[PDB]
Amino acid sequence: PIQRTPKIQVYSRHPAENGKSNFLNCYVSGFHPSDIEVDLLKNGERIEKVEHSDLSFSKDWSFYLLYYTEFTPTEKDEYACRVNHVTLSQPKIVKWDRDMGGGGEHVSFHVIQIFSFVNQSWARGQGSGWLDELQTHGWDSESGTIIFLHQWSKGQFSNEELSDLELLFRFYLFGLTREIQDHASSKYPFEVQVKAGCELHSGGSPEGFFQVAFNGLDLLSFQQTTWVPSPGCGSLAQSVCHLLNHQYEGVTETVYNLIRSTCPRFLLGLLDAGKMYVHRQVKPEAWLSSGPSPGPGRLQLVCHVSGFYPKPVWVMWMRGEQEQQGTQLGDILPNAQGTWYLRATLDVADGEAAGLSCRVKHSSLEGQDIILYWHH
Numbered sequence: 001p002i003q004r005t006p007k008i009q010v011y012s013r014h015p016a017e018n019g020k021s022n023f024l025n026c027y028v029s030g031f032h033p034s035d036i037e038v039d040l041l042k043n044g045e046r047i048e049k050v051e052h053s054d055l056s057f058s059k060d061w062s063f064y065l066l067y068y069t070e071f072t073p074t075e076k077d078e079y080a081c082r083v084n085h086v087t088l089s090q091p092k093i094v095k096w097d098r099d100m101g102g103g104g105e106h107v108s109f110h111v112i113q114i115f116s117f118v119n120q121s122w123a124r125g126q127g128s129g130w131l132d133e134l135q136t137h138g139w140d141s142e143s144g145t146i147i148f149l150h151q152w153s154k155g156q157f158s159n160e161e162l163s164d165l166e167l168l169f170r171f172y173l174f175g176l177t178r179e180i181q182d183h184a185s186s187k188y189p190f191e192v193q194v195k196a197g198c199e200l201h202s203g204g205s206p207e208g209f210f211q212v213a214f215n216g217l218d219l220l221s222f223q224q225t226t227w228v229p230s231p232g233c234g235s236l237a238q239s240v241c242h243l244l245n246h247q248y249e250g251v252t253e254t255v256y257n258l259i260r261s262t263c264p265r266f267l268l269g270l271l272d273a274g275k276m277y278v279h280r281q282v283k284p285e286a287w288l289s290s291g292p293s294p295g296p297g298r299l300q301l302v303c304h305v306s307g308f309y310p311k312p313v314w315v316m317w318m319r320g321e322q323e324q325q326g327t328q329l330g331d332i333l334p335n336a337q338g339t340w341y342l343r344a345t346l347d348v349a350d351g352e353a354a355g356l357s358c359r360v361k362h363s364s365l366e367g368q369d370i371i372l373y374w375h376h
């Protein structure tokens with residue numbers, strides 16, 4: 001409790017051309033609880049070499065996962081994303097289909113924790129590090145060590161400082177668990193989610209946060225130096241804010257230092273070390289495919305823009321210079337190696353399809369847009 005149903009999006013990283021090698025992405029988001037089963041399928045079989053990000057969540061507090069794998073489109077073969085969840089009567093299988101598109105400021109650094117307590121002596125725990133929507137760290141649960149995903153993931157910190165963080169985290173975890181095992185007594189499962197870290201805004205002003213959700217609900221947050229419960233009431237929230245407020249501070253002194261000070265300095269180190277490796281402005285490539293039929297005598301035009309970085313992008317359906325108002329822009333989804341994916345669709349009558357084109361705007365293009373024309 002309580003329950004959210006997974007949303008599933010499947011998309012390739014390149015145009016689909018039979019025999020030619022490609023990447024199958026599956027993005028699974030909007031779900032609660034965290035317990036889930038995602039497989040990429042080839043011809044009904046589970047593909048055993050896949051990549052997945054660790055479990056993360058949205059501001060909603062609902063979870064999302066990215067999945068991907070190498071694949072080769074063929075006339076013959078068949079690919080899917082199969083998801084099982086407590087909100088699903090049956091595992092949803094959503095095929096990837098060329099012809100349907102395969103249906104379904106500031107920088108930030110945050111540390112993510114998910115704790116799953118089935119009871120007192122049984123509990124999963126997982127945590128990771130995120131630089132904006134790019135995962136940069138993992139946590140080795142069994143040894144209490146940090147997994148550095150990229151060559152630049154130490155991000156201009158020394159080994160000696162990163163050791164201290166590891167140790168720090170270890171104690172802290174011991175803390176949460178003992179603390180959470182007490183508060184003990186028709187039941188019995190619950191979930192806890194912590195999002196701790198910092199935004200850095202243009203001009204250099206940082207903004208820490210350390211916020212908790214209980215069973216997918218806002219529980220409490222750290223707000224410019226005061227732990228603050230979310231409206232309930234709301235007594236677990238007030239009680240725990242109370243413990244953290246006044247039983248122990250010095251932990252909040254630590255936390256304050258961590259999120260206002262350590263965090264942004266780490267974050268900027270990440271940015272500095274990352275620039276070296278990856279990546280400059282990257283041009284998207286684009287392609288057309290139909291999408292699912294909107295009905296008899298009607299077509300769905302899909303326009304895919306993939307592999308562009310940075311994120312800011314403009315995509316629209318056109319007749320000439322006229323924007324077509326029906327255009328629906330999907331969400332901008334992440335690709336395997338960190339670039340972006342977006343698709344725009346348009347539903348149109350059979351005979352009015354000819355002459356419509358997809359226009360794509362991006363920084364990397366030097367003002368020379370990508371134009372693609374629908375043909376029959």
Ligand SMILES: CCCCCCC[C@H](C)CCC[C@H](C)CCC[C@H](C)CCC[C@H](C)CCC[C@H](C)CCCOP(=O)(O)O[C@@H]1O[C@H](CO)[C@@H](O)[C@H](O)[C@@H]1O
Nearest residue numbers: 125126127128129137138139168171172175196251254263
């Ligand atoms: C499974 C989940 C694992 C998740 C970890 C994944 C992390 C991933 C992979 C790695 C990225 C690494 C990067 C470089 C980190 C940059 C800095 C980040 C932005 C700040 C992070 C914020 C934390 C999250 C807040 C934690 C609370 C701390 C630690 C203060 C509490 C003090 O315990 P203590 O006062 O010493 O207190 C101790 O513990 C208890 C009380 O706490 C008590 O019992 C004891 O008295 C004891 O003293």
Ligand SMILES: *[C@@H]1O[C@H](CO)[C@@H](O)[C@H](O)[C@H]1NC(C)=O
Nearest residue numbers: 117118119120121122123188
């Ligand atoms: C915890 O759940 C597990 C798994 O179902 C079970 O074996 C165990 O007895 C449960 N409770 C406690 C208090 O150990």
Ligand SMILES: CCCCCCCCCCCC
Nearest residue numbers: 172173175176192212240251
């Ligand atoms: C180990 C004690 C320090 C923990 C600091 C964060 C506490 C967040 C509240 C969690 C309630 C479920």
